[PDB]
Structures are given as C-alpha cells and as structure tokens.
Coordinates of C-alpha atoms in Angstrom, one line a residue:
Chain A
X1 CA 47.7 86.0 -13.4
X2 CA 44.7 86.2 -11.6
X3 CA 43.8 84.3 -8.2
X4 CA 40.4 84.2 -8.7
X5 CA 40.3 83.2 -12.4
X6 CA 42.6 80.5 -11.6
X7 CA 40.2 79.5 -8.7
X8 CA 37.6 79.2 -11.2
X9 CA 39.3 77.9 -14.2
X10 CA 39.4 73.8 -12.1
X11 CA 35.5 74.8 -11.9
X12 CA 35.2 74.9 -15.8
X13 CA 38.1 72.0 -15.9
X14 CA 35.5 70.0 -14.2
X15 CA 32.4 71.3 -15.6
X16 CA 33.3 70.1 -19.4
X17 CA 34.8 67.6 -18.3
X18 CA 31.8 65.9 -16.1
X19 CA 29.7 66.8 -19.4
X20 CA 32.2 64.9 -21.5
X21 CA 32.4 62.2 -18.7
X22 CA 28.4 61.9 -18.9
X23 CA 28.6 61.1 -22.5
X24 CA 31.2 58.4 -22.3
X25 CA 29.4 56.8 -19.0
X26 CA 26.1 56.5 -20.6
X27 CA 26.3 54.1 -23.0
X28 CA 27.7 50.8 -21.9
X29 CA 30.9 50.8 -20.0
X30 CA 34.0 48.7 -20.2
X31 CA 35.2 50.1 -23.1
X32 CA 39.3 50.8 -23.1
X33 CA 40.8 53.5 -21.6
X34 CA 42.7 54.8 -24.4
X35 CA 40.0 55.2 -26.4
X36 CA 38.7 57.3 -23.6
X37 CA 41.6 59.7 -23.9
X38 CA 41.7 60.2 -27.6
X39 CA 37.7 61.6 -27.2
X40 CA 39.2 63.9 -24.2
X41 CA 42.6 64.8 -25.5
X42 CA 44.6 64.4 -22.7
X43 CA 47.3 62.2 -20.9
X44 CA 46.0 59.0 -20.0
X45 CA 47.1 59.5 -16.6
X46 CA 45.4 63.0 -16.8
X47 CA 42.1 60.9 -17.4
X48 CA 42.6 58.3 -14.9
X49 CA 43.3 60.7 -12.3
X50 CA 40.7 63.1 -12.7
X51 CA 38.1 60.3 -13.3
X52 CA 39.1 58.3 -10.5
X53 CA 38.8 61.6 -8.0
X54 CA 35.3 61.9 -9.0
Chain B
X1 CA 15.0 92.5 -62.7
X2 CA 16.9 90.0 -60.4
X3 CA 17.0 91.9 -57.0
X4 CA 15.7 90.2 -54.3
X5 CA 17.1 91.7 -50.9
X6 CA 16.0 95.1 -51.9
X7 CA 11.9 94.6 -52.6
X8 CA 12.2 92.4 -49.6
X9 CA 13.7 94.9 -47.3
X10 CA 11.1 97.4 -48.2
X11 CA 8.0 95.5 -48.1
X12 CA 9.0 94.3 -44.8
X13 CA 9.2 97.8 -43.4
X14 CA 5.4 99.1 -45.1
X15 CA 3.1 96.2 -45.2
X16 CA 3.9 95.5 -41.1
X17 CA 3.0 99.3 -39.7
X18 CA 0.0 99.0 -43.2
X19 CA -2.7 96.7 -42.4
X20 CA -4.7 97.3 -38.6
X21 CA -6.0 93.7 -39.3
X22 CA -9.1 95.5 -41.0
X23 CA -9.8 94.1 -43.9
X24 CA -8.3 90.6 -44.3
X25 CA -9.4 89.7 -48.2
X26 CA -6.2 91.8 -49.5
X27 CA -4.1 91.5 -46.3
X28 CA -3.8 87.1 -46.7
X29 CA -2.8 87.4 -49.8
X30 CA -0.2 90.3 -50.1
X31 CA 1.4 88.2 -47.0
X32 CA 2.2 85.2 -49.1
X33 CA 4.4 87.5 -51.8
X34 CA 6.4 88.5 -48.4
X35 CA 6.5 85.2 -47.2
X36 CA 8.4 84.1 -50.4
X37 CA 11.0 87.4 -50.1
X38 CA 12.5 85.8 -47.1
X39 CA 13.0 82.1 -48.8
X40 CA 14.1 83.3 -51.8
X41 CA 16.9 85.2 -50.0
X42 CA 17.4 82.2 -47.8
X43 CA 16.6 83.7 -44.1
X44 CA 14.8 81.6 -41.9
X45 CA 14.3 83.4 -39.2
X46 CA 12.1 86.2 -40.7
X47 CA 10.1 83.4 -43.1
X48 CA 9.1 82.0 -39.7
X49 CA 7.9 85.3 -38.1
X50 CA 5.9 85.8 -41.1
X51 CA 4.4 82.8 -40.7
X52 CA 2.7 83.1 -37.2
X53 CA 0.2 85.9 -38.5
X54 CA -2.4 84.2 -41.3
X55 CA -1.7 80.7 -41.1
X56 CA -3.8 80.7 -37.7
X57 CA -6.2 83.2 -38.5
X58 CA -7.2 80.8 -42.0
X59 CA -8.5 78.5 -39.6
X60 CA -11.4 79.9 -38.3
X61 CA -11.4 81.7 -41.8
X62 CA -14.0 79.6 -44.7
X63 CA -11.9 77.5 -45.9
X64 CA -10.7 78.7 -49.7
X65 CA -9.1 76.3 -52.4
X66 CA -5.5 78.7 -53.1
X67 CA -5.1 80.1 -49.4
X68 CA -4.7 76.5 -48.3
X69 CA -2.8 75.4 -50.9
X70 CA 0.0 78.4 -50.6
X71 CA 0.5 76.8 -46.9
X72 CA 1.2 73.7 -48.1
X73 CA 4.1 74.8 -50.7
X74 CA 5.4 77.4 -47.8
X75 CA 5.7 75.2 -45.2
X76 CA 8.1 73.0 -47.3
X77 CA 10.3 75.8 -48.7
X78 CA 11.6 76.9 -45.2
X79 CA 12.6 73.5 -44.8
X80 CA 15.7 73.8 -46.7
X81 CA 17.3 75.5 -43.9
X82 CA 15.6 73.4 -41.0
X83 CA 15.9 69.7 -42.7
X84 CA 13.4 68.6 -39.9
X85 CA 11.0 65.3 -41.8
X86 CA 9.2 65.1 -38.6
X87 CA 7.4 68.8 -38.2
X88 CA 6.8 69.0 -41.7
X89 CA 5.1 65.6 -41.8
X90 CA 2.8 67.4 -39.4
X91 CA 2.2 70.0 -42.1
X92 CA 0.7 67.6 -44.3
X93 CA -1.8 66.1 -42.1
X94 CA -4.2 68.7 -43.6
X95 CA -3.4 68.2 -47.2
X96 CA -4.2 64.4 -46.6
X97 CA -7.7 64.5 -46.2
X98 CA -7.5 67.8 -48.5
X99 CA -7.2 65.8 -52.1
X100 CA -8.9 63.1 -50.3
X101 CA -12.2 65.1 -49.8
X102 CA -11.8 68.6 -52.3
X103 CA -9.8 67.5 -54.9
X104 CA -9.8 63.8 -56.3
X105 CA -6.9 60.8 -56.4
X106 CA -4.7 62.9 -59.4
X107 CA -3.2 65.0 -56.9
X108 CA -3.6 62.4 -53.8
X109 CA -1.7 60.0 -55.2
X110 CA 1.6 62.4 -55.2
X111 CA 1.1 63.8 -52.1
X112 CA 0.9 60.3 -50.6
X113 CA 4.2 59.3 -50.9
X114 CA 5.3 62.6 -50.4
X115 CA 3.6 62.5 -46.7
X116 CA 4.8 59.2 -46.6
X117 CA 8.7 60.1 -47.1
X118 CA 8.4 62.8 -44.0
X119 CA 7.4 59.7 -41.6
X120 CA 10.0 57.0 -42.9
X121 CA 12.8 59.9 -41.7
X122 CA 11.0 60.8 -39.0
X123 CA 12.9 60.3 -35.9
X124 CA 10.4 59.0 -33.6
X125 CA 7.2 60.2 -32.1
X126 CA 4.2 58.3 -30.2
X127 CA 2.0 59.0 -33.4
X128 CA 4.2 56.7 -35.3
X129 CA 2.0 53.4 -35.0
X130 CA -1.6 55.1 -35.5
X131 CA -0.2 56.9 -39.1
X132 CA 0.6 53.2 -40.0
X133 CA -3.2 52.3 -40.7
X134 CA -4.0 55.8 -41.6
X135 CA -7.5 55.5 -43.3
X136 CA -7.3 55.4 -46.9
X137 CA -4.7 53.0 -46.5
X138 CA -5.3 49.5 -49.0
X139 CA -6.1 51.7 -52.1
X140 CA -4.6 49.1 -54.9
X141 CA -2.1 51.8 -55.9
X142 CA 1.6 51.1 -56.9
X143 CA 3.1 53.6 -55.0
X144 CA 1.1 53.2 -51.9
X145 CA 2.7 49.2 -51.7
X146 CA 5.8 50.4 -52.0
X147 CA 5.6 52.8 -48.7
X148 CA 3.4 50.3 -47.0
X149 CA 6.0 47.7 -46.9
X150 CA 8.6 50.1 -46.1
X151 CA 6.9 50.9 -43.5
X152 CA 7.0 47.2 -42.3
X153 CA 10.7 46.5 -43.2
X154 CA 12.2 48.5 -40.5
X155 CA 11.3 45.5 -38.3
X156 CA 12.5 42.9 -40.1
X157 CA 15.3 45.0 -42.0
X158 CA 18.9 43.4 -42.7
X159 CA 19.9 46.4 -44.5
X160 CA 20.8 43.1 -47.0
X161 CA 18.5 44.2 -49.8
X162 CA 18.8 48.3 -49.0
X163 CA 20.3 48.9 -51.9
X164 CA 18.5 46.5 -54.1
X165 CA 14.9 48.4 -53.5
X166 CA 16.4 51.7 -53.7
X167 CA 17.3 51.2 -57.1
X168 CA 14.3 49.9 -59.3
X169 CA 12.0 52.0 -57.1
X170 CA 12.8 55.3 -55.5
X171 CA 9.7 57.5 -56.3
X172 CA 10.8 59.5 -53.3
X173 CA 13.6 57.9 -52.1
X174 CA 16.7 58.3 -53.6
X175 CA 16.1 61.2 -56.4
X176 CA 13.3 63.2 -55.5
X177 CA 12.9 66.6 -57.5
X178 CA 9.5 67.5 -55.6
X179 CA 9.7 69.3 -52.6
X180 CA 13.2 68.9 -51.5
X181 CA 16.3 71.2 -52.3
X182 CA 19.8 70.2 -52.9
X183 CA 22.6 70.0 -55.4
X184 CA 22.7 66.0 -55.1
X185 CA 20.8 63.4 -54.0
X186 CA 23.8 62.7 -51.4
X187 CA 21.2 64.1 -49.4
X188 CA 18.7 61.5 -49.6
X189 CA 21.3 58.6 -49.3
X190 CA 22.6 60.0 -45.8
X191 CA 19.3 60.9 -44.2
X192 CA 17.8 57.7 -44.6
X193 CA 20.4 55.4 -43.9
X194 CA 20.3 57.4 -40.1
X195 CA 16.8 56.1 -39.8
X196 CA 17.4 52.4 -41.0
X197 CA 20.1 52.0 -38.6
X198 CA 18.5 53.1 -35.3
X199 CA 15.3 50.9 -36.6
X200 CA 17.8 47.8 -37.3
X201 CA 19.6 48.1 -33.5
X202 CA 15.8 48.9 -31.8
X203 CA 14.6 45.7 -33.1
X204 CA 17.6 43.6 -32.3
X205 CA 17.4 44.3 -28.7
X206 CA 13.6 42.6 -28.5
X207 CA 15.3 39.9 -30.7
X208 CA 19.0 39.4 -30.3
X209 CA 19.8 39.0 -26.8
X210 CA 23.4 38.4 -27.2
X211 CA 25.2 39.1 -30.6
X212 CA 29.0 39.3 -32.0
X213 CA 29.9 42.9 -32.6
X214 CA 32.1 41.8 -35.6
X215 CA 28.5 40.2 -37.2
X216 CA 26.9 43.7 -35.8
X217 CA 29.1 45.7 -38.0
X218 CA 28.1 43.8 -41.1
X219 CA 24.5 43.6 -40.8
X220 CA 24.3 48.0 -40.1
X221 CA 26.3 48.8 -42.8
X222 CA 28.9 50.4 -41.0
X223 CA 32.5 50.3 -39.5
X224 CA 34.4 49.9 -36.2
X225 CA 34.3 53.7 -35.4
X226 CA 30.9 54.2 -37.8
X227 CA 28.9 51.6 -35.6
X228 CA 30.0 53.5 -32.2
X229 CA 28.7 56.7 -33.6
X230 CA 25.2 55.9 -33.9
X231 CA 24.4 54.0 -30.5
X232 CA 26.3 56.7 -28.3
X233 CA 23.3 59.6 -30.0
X234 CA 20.3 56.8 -28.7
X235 CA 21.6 56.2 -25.7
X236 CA 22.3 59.7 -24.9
X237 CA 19.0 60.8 -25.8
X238 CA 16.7 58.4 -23.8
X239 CA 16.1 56.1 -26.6
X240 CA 17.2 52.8 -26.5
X241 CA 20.2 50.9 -24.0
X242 CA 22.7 48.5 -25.3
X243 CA 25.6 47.4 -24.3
X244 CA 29.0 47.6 -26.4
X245 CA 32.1 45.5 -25.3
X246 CA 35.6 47.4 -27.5
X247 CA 38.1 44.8 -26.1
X248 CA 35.7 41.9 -26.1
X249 CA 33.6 42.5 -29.2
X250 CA 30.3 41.3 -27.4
X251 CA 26.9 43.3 -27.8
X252 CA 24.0 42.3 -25.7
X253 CA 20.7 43.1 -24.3
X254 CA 21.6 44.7 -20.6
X255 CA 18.5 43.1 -19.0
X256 CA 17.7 44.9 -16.0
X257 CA 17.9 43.3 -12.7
X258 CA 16.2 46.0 -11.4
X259 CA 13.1 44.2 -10.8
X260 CA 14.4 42.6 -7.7
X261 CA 13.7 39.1 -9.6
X262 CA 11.2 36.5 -7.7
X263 CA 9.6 39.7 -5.9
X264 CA 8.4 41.2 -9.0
X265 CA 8.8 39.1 -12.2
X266 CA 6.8 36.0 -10.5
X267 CA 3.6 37.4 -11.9
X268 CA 3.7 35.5 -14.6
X269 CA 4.1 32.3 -13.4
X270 CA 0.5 32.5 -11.0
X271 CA -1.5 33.0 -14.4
X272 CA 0.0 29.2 -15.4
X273 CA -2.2 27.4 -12.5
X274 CA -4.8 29.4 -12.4
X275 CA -6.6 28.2 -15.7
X276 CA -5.8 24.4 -14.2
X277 CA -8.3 23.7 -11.8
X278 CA -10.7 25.9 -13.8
X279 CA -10.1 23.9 -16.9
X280 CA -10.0 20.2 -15.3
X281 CA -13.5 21.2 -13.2
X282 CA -15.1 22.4 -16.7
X283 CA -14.4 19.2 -18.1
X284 CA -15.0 16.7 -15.9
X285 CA -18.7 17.1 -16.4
X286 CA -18.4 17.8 -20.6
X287 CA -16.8 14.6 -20.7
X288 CA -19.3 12.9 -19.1
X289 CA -21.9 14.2 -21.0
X290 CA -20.7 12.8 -24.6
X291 CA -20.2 9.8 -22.8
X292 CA -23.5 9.0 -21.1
X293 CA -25.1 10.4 -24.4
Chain C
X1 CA 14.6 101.0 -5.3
X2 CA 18.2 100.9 -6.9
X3 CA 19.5 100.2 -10.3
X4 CA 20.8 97.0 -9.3
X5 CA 17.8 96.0 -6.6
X6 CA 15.2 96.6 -9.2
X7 CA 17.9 94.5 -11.9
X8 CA 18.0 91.3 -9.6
X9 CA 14.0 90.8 -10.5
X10 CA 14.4 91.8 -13.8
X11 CA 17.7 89.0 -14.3
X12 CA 15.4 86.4 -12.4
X13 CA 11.7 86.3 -13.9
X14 CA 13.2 87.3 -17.5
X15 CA 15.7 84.3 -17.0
X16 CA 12.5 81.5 -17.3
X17 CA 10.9 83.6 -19.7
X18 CA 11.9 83.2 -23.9
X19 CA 13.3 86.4 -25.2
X20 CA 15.2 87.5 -28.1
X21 CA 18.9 89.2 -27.8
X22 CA 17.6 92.5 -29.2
X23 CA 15.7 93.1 -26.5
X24 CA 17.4 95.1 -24.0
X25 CA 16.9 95.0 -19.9
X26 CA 18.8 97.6 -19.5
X27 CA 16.7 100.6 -20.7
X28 CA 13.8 98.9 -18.7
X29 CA 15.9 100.1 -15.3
X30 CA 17.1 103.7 -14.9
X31 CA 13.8 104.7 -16.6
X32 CA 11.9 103.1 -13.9
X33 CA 11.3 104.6 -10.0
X34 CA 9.9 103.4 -7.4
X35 CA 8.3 100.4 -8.5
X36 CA 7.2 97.0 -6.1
X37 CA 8.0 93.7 -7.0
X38 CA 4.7 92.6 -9.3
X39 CA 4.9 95.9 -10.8
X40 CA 8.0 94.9 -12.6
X41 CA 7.2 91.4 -12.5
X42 CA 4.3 92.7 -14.4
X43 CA 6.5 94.2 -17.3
X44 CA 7.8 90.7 -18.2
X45 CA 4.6 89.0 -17.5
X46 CA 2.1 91.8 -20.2
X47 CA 5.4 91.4 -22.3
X48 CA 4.7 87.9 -23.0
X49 CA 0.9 88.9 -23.6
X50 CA 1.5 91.3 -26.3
X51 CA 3.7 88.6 -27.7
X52 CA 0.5 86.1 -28.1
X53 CA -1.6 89.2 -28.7
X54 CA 1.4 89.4 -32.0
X55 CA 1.3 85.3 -32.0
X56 CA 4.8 85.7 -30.7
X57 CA 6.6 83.3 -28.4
X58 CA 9.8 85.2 -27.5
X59 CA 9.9 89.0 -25.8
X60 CA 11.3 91.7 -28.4
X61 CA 12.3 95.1 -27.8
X62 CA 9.0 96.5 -29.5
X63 CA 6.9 94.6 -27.0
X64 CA 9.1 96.1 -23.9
X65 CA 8.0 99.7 -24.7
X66 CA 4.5 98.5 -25.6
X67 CA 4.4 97.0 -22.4
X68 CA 6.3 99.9 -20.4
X69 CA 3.7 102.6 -20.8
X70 CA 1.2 100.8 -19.0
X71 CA 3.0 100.4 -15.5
X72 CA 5.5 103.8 -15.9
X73 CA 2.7 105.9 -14.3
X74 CA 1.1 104.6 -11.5
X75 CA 0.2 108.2 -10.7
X76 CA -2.9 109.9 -12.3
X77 CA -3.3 112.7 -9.7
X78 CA -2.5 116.6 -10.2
X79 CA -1.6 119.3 -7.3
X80 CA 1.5 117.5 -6.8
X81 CA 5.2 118.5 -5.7
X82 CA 3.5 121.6 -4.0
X83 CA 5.9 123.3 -1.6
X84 CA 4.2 126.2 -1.7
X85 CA 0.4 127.7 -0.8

C-alpha cells in the first residue's frame, strides 16, 4: 500500500537476489538453467530476465 | 541434590562483585567450580565470559600441576556447543609439551592422538604443514603410526580403503568416548568424511587436469546433488577453483590464462640454456685431463 | 548539541566498534549536554578500554556507565549560575 516500501521492496528483490546470484556465479559456470531456478524458486523466465538485466 | 541452574545463578551474582583481584590463591580455584555451572547447564555464552579472567592471568602465574590441568578439561567441555576441531587443537599445544616435559609417556601417549584428532578435522590453517613433523614425532608407538600415515593419506586418498581402516583401528576415529559428547558416533562418521573430501578434490586439481564427473562421483563417495554440495562451500570461501560441467559431465583444472602466456610463463624456459654453455665449457677441459693423463 | 546530532556520532563510531545488544545508546544521549565530538567519541573509545581492562572484547551496558562518569562533568568549578551579587 505504500509508495515508498514498494520503491524499496525491487531494492531488497535485487539485494538477495545478487547475493544468491554471487553464489551460483562463483563456482564454475555453464551449468543448466533450470537448475538455476530450482535454488531461486522462481519462473525460469523470472531468472532469465532478471539475470540477463544485470 | 540435582539442581543445577539454581547454585549457578547465585554464585554468578556473589563471587563477581566478591573478589577485588586481591588474593588470587582462593579466587583461581573457586573460578573453576563456576566455570563448570555454566557447562553443566549447557550455556555457552556465560562459560566463555568466565573464561577470559584466570586463564590469562596463570600465565605469568608459576606454573602449578592442577591449575593447568583444569584448562585443559575446560576448554574441551565448551566444545560441545561450538564443534570447532581447529581452536581447540590450539588448546592443546600446551598440554603437548606438558606430559612431554612434567609428566611422563603414560598420559602423552593419549593425549597424542587426542591432539592429533583436532588437526585431521581441522579445516585448514597455514600451521598445518609445520605440526606435521612436530618434535617428538618417530616415537615407535602404535598409535602414533596410525595418525602419522593419516596424516599422509589425505594426499594420496581414494576414499577406496576409508572404510577399511576405520574399522580395525579407530582409537579416535570412529568411537571415541574421551573428550567428545554425543549420543552416537554419527558424529564422528559425518565430520570426517567433510575433511577427506575437500583433501581428495584439493589434490586432484595438482593431479587430474581433466577428469569424468561420473568417475568423480565414485572416487568422493558421494552423489549427483552430494558432489555439488561440497565444491560450491570451497569455492565460495576462497579455497580452491574447479570447474563443474552439469550437461556435459566434465571436471577440470580451469588453468588460468591470466598470465598473459609467452610474457610471463617464459621464465622457465631461459633456465634450460643457461646451464649449456656453462656445462660444455666445464667439460671441455675435464675431459682432456683424463685423457692426456 | 541535539538528541539526534549528538546520536549520528554515537550510530557511527559504535557501528565499527563490537558491542553486545544489552547495551543501550540510548541512555548515553538525553543524559548528555553539551558535549564535542571526541568527547563522545571518547565514551566508545574508554568503553572498549574498560573492556580489556575486564579482558572483554565487546561493549556492555556496565562498561557504558563505568565509562560515563568520567566525561559527564567536564566542569569542576563553583560560583556558578550566579544571577545575582
């Protein structure tokens, strides 16, 4: 209901996300992306299309 | 009586505003009673507290037979809570050289493979290799081979005969009733197996350059999703790099390029030539010597 | 000083100092006037001595008042709020 929570609730969207992120991207990559979306819990495209923006 | 929270409680609350650090004969010793309050009623945080006051001070205190001793059995009970094998292997650094110099090799020998245990599940540390030689180290004792190649296994380990040497000895390995608490030994099964698996991938990489994932899986012990969670915590701590292929099965070294190739990595090709014309001009006189002669 | 100018220094130097949750900033505010900017950068910093002076390495709420009474009074002079004579 509030502007400026929902303004900052993309900034925690992003911030545990970029954390979770960093733990998938420091090991080796090429690893397949629905495996990547059962760690996160989230749509595939979800993943894809927040990853990709970053 | 059996009431433990209640004398604790209390004696926390008198013996704190008591003693003006005074007289510390009586004071050192009425601290180790309270010291035990707090693990038998299982808090850590207040067994720790307590534990910053005389353990310094005994230091530049003469050094007594029980005060020391009393550290030494401390120390290890507020470990159940913590579980940490590398601070408490610290810990025993003193009672080392304590039955190796006061007392004599009928309490060394236990306290040996005891210390000994602490380091095997240690996680790492830069002290590692020096504690390998040690100093009494080659005493012609049965239990001190047995830690010694253990030591030396992680190197060449298979995990192939794990579970063989686990079974005819385990002094401290798999049951232990000395020093450790726990309702099982599941304890000791789980804890060491963490540390023979990040030993087995650390030595692959100088090794293995390029291995199967499917022959990986069989020489940790592990699974598909059990292999995947033991890399991902030395990686993410600064450990170790490897590289891990899901579609393609294919683990390998990662060497890094980073060292711009011919620019760098050349310097060990100039050491090749440089003992040529040093050699040849050596021995074209040597030669001639045993020949004129 | 304000309750909230003098609570910006004690939110900053506290913040790369160790402390303990039972220690309380708060009562370390509207009890003080007029203080500079060492002066309560002071309180933290002899807080963290007493703690070594204990063999302590976080900040308790003990050590706070310990630590207060030293740099509450910076005045030890008398004939004082006189309005009158």
């Amino acid at each position: 209901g509030d502007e400026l929570t929902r303004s900052h609730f993309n900034a925690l969207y992003d911030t545990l996300l970029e954390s979770n992120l960093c733990k998938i991207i420091e090991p080796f990559e090429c690893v397949e992306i629905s495996h990547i979306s059962k760690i996160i819990g989230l749509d595939t495209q979800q993943v894809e299309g927040k990853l990709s923006q970053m | 009586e059996g009431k433990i929270d209640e004398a604790a409680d209390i004696l926390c609350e008198l013996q704190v505003e008591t003693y003006g650090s005074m007289e510390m004969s009586e004071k050192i010793q009425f601290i180790l009673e309270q010291m035990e309050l707090s693990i038998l009623k299982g808090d850590y945080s207040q067994a720790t507290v307590l534990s910053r006051k005389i353990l310094k001070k005994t230091f530049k205190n003469p050094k007594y037979e029980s005060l020391k001793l009393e550290y030494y059995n401390l120390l290890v009970k507020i470990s159940l809570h913590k579980r940490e094998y590398l601070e408490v292997a610290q810990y025993l650094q003193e009672i080392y050289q304590t039955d190796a110099i006061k007392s004599d090799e009928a309490k060394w020998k236990p306290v040996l493979s005891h210390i000994v245990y602490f380091l095997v599940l240690s996680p790492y540390g830069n002290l590692q290799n020096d504690l390998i030689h040690k100093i009494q180290n080659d005493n012609n004792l049965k239990k001190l081979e047995s830690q010694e190649s253990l030591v030396k296994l992680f190197t060449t380990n298979e995990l192939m005969r794990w579970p063989i040497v686990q079974k005819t000895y385990e002094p401290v390995l798999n049951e232990d009733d000395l020093a450790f608490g726990g309702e099982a030994n599941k304890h000791h099964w789980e804890d060491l197996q963490k540390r023979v698996i990040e030993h087995n991938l650390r030595v692959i990489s100088e090794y293995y350059s390029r291995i199967t994932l499917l022959r990986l899986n069989e020489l940790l012990d592990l699974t598909e999703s059990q292999t995947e969670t033991y890399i991902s915590d030395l990686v993410n701590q600064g450990i170790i790099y490897a590289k891990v292929n899901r579609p393609a099965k294919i683990v390998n070294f990662e060497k890094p390029k980073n060292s711009s190739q011919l620019l760098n990595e050349w310097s060990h090709n100039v050491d090749e030539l440089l003992e040529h014309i040093e050699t040849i001009g050596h021995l074209i006189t040597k030669e001639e010597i045993m020949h004129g002669l | 000083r304000d309750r909230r100018e003098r609570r910006l220094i004690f939110g900053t130097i506290a913040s790369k100092m160790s402390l303990a949750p039972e220690a309380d900033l708060d009562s370390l505010i509207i009890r003080n006037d007029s203080l500079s900017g060492a002066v309560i950068a002071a309180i933290m910093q002899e807080a963290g001595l007493r703690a070594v002076r204990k063999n302590r390495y976080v900040i308790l709420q003990s050590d706070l008042e310990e630590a207060y009474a030293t740099q509450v009074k910076t005045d030890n002079t008398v004939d004082k709020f006189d309005f009158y004579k």
